[PDB]
Amino acid sequence: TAPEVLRQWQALAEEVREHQFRYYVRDAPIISDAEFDELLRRLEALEEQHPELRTPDSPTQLVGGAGFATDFEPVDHLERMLSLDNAFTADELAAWAGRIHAEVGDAAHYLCELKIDGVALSLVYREGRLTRASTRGDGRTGEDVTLNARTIADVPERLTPGDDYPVPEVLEVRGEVFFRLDDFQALNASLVEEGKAPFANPRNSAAGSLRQKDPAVTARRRLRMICHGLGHVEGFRPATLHQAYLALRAWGLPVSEHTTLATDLAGVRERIDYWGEHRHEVDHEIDGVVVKVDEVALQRRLGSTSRAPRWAIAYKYP
Numbered sequence: 162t163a164p165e166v167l168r169q170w171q172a173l174a175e176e177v178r179e180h181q182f183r184y185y186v187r188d189a190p191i192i193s194d195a196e197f198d199e200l201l202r203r204l205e206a207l208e209e210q211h212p213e214l215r216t217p218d219s220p221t222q223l224v225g226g227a228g229f230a231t232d233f234e235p236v237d238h239l240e241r242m243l244s245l246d247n248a249f250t251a252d253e254l255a256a257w258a259g260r261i262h263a264e265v266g267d268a269a270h271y272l273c274e275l276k277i278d279g280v281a282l283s284l285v286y287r288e289g290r291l292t293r294a295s296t297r298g299d300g301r302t303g304e305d306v307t308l309n310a311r312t313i314a315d316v317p318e319r320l321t322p323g324d325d326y327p328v329p330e331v332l333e334v335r336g337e338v339f340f341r342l343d344d345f346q347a348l349n350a351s352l353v354e355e356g357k358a359p360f361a362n363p364r365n366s367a368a369g370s371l372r373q374k375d376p377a378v379t380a381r382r383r384l385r386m387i388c389h390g391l392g393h394v395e396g397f398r399p400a401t402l403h404q405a406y407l408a409l410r411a412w413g414l415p416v417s418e419h420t421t422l423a424t425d426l427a428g429v430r431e432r433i434d435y436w437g438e439h440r441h442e443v444d445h446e447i448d449g450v451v452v453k454v455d456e457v458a459l460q461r462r463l464g465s466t467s468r469a470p471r472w473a474i475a476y477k478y479p
C-alpha cells in the first residue's frame with residue numbers, strides 16, 4: 162500500500178534523525194551503535210524496495226549531523242568532510258574490492274588503518290600555524306572548536322618544516338579525537354564520584370569533552386588525536402596517502418603507527434583478520450578497519466558520493 166509504505170518510511174526516517182540528533186548534537190545516544198546501524202539499514206532497504214521513497218535529504222544520502230543547529234559558531238570546511246560506507250561481512254568487503262578493481266584495476270594498493278571510535282576533527286594550518294579546528298557538522302559546515310583543539314597535547318600549534326617537506330601554504334587535515342580506554346574509565350569514575358552522569362562509551366566521552374563551550378573543560382581532559390585524511394591543501398601534492406603520512410609525521414602531526422599497506426584484497430583480508438584477533442590490545446576503542454585506495458590519482462578517479470568516498474570502506478567488527 163503506497164499510503165502504508167510512506168508512513169512506514171516517515172516513522173523510520175524520523176527515528177533515524179532523532180538518534181542522529183542525540184548522537185551528533187548531544188553526544189548522548191539512547192540506543193547502541195549496532196541498533197542504530199540496523200535502523201539505518203532498514204531505512205535503506207525500504208528505499209531500495211520502493212524507489213518512490215528515494216528523497217534527496219533522506220538520512221541514507223546525507224552526512225550524519227546534517228540538518229541540525231547547534232550552540233557553537235558555524236564554520237565552513239575548505240573541502241567536504243565525509244562519512245564512510247560500511248562493510249559488515251566478507252561479501253560486502255569483496256563487493257567493494259571488486260568494484261575498485263573493476264574501475265582502476267590491479268594498480269590500486271590498499272592502506273589498512275584502524276578505525277578509531279572517536280569524534281571527527283578538522284584542522285586548518287595556514288603557513289604552518291593552526292588557525293581553525295572544527296567538527297564535521299553536516300559535512301560542509303562544522304562547529305568551531307579551535308580553542309578546545311589547541312588544548313590537545315597531540316595537536317601542535319605550528320608545523321615543523323622539513324627539508325623534504327616544506328610547510329604547505331594551506332593544510333586542512335582530518336583526524337580522530339579520542340581517549341585512551343583507561344583515561345575514558347577514569348573520567349567516568351571521576352564524573353560518577355561528583356554525582357554527574359558518566360558518558361555512554363569512549364566515543365561520546367571524547368565528543369562531549371571536545372564540544373565544550375568552555376575550553377578549560379577540554380584542557381583538563383587527556384584527549385588524544387590521530388590524523389587520518391586530507392581536506393584542502395595548497396602547496397603540497399602527495400601522490401599517495403602513505404607519502405602524505407610521511408609529510409604529516411615530518412610536520413609533527415600525530416599519525417597512527419598501526420597502519421599497513423596491502424597490495425591486494427588478500428593482503429587486506431589478512432590485516433582485517435589480524436585486528437579481529439588483536440584489537441583488544443590497542444589502548445583505545447576500535448570499531449573496525451578502514452581500507453583506502455592509496456594512490457591519490459585513483460581516489461580522484463573513483464570519486465565520492467554525497468556522503469562518503471568511493472575509494473574507502475570501513476570494515477566493521479561484530
Ligand SMILES: NC(=O)c1ccc[n+]([C@@H]2O[C@H](COP(=O)([O-])OP(=O)(O)OC[C@H]3O[C@@H](n4cnc5c(N)ncnc54)[C@H](O)[C@@H]3O)[C@@H](O)[C@H]2O)c1
Pocket residue numbers: 180181183184185190191192193194195197198224225243244245274275276277278279280281282297336337389390451475
Ligand atoms: N547510537 C546512536 O544512536 C547513533 C546515532 C548515529 C550514529 N551512530 C554511529 O555513528 C557512526 C556512523 O556515523 P559516521 O558518519 O560518524 O560514520 P563512521 O564513524 O562509521 O565512519 C566515518 C568516520 O570514521 C572516522 N574514522 C575513524 N578512524 C578513521 C580512519 N582511520 N580513517 C578515516 N576515518 C576514520 C572519521 O571521523 C569518519 O567521520 C556509526 O558507528 C553509528 O553506529 C550512533
Ligand SMILES: [Ca+2]
Pocket residue numbers: 181224225226
Ligand atoms: Ca549517522
Ligand SMILES: [Mg+2]
Pocket residue numbers: 179
Ligand atoms: Mg523517541
Ligand SMILES: [Mg+2]
Pocket residue numbers: 277278279
Ligand atoms: Mg565513528
